[PDB]
Amino acid sequence: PVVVRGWLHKQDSSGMRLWKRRWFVLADYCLFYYKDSREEAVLGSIPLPSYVISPVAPEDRISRKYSFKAVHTGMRTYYFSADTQEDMNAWVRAMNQAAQV
């Protein structure tokens, strides 16, 4: 059921350049996020169908290392950052596989 789980920083949706560390789970074609890795009470969800996920580009003007974005096909863009390059790459690949269902 779960494809991948782990910590990501997520940028706030109001453009204040604030990053919050949440625990993410990809399951059922969606991202679910939680306060921590206990996976107790889901805080929110981003269903992935039709999103395109990629490492950030220069024009995104994101400074945080290992950052990537999910763009809704802009209807809405989410920015995430992982703690390692390997984990970034694994999330981009998993999220695109789900989004391309």
UniProtKB/Swiss-Prot annotation:
Residue ranges of domain PH in the record:
1-100
Which cellular compartments is it found in?
Cell junction, Adherens junction; Cytoplasm; Cytoplasm, Cytoskeleton, Microtubule organizing center, Centrosome
Q: Give the multimer and partner information.
A: Interacts with CAMSAP3 and CTNND1. Interacts (via WW domains) with TSPAN33 (via cytoplasmic domain) and with PDZD11; the interaction with TSPAN33 is dependent on PDZD11 being bound to PLEKHA7 and facilitates the docking of ADAM10 to zonula adherens through interaction of TSPAN33 with ADAM10.
Q: What does this protein do?
A: Required for zonula adherens biogenesis and maintenance. Acts via its interaction with CAMSAP3, which anchors microtubules at their minus-ends to zonula adherens, leading to the recruitment of KIFC3 kinesin to the junctional site. Mediates docking of ADAM10 to zonula adherens through a PDZD11-dependent interaction with the ADAM10-binding protein TSPAN33.
Recorded protein name is Pleckstrin homology domain-containing family A member 7
Instruction: State the organism of origin.
Output: Homo sapiens
Tell which residues of the whole protein are contained here. Answer: 164 to 283 of 1121
